[PDB]
Design a protein around this ligand. Structure first.
Ligand SMILES: *C/C=C(C)/C=C/C=C(C)/C=C/C1=C(C)CCCC1(C)C
Ligand SMILES: CCCCCCCC/C=C\CCCCCCCC(=O)O
Ligand SMILES: CCCCCCCC/C=C\CCCCCCCC(=O)O
Ligand SMILES: CCCCCCCC/C=C\CCCCCCCC(=O)O
Ligand SMILES: CCCCCCCC/C=C\CCCCCCCC(=O)O
Ligand SMILES: CCCCCCCC/C=C\CCCCCCCC(=O)O
Ligand SMILES: CCCCCCCC/C=C\CCCCCCCC(=O)O
Ligand SMILES: CCCCCCCC/C=C\CCCCCCCC(=O)O
Ligand SMILES: [Cl-]
Ligand SMILES: [Cl-]
Length: 264
């Protein structure tokens, strides 16, 4: 049902996708160790925001690892090209994984925005429901990326509505609670918003690849877009969230945070 299954791949195409996914694994698990070691310099009220980045690194790292092994399982070099064998490859499992990873990305944002108690629970709940609506409708949509492009587009439109509303909740909370943020991170959090807008928008672009480039090079392009988007939305984003957590910790008087920033 996926466009990947339609084509044979050159040695170059096949190996490049393998390298993309493998590099993705390495970057996330390398970043994982970074978040782990810096977590001790984060104040208790923010420390979970850094822990969530560890959770995202392993979650994303495992899905990229799984995709890479699926890639090599599904294809074999036969008569001059990589051809589909008995096992299958699908991006569908990425969608399933977003059901967990996207709430984690949103939660760590709410934490450094200094949301607490009732407002935190209610905001998280609405955000997660919006994200799940986006993901599920998008998942349904890509089931038709070969059979029914018109249906892919309509489900994509519904998904985009959830996307836009989710982003509106995010923007509203960010620009409202920006003033509560310490150590100059009121400025930094604005860049985080724009980073999210940019990085997350790459995913619906990848979703539409079967509509504007239905060929083997389109398959490569989609994996390339996922790679850019994954690294930007999880790793670079996580680094900014953790930076914001540490800076606010230091400004709140947390001594390990103050000492850590002093060494650099
Ligand atoms: C780490 C993974 C992340 C941040 C994934 C984000 C995914 C999206 C923003 C997906 C958006 C979609 C649309 C807005 C329309 C087409 C269907 C989706 C699910 C690909
Ligand atoms: C930076 C270099 C990126 C690697 C290019 C891989 C594409 C190829 O070799 O076919
Ligand atoms: C934050 C951005 C992260 C960027 C990650 C991507 C790094 C590698 C990117 C691709 C370089 C282009 C490689 C040339 C493609 C050759 C075409 C092919 O062989 O199929
Ligand atoms: C392989 C990676 C091993 C990582 C172990 C690092 C332990 C961190 C110690 C700590 O700060 O609590
Ligand atoms: C095939 C029917 C798809 C139904 C989509 C349900 C939308 C999910 C909404 C928020 C949870
Ligand atoms: C909750 C929203 C559920 C779906 C809204 C209906 C619009 C998209 C569904 C398309 C159905 C189809 O193409 O057959
Ligand atoms: C051409 C790859 C980069 C595309 C970035 C633009 C999409 C996000 C815009 C906000
Ligand atoms: C080319 C540019 C690529 C961008 C690479 C991003 C690298 C890591 C981001 C680190 C986040 C630190 C937050 C900003 C620090 C500060 O505000 O002074
Ligand atoms: Cl604290
Ligand atoms: Cl993920």
């Amino acid at each position: 049902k996926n466009i990947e299954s339609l084509f044979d791949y050159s040695a170059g195409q096949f190996e490049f996708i393998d390298h993309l996914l493998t590099m993705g694994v390495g970057v996330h698990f390398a970043a994982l160790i970074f978040f782990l070691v810096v977590s001790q310099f984060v104040a208790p009220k923010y420390r979970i925001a850094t822990a969530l980045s560890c959770i995202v690194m392993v979650s994303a790292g495992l899905i990229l690892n799984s995709q890479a092994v699926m890639w090599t399982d599904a294809y074999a070099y036969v008569d001059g090209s990589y051809q589909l064998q008995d096992l299958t490859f699908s991006n569908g499992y990425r969608y399933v994984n977003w059901m967990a990873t996207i709430p984690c990305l949103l939660l760590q944002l709410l934490i450094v925005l200094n949301l607490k108690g009732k407002e935190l629970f209610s905001t998280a709940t609405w955000l997660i429901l919006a994200a799940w609506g986006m993901i599920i409708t998008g998942y349904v949509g890509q089931l038709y990326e070969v059979d029914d492009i018109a249906q892919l587009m309509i489900w994509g439109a519904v998904s985009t509505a959830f996307f836009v509303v989710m982003n509106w909740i995010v923007g509203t909370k960010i620009f409202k609670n920006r003033a509560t943020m310490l150590g100059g991170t009121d400025s930094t959090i604005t860049k985080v918003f724009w980073l999210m807008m940019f990085a997350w928008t790459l995913y619906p672009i990848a979703y539409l690849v079967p509509a504007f480039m239905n060929n083997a090079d389109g398959v490569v392009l989609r994996q390339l877009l996922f790679t850019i988007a994954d690294i930007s939305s999880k790793v670079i984003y996580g680094l900014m969230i953790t930076y914001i957590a540490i800076q606010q910790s230091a400004a709140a008087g947390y001594v390990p945070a103050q000492q850590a920033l002093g060494r650099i």
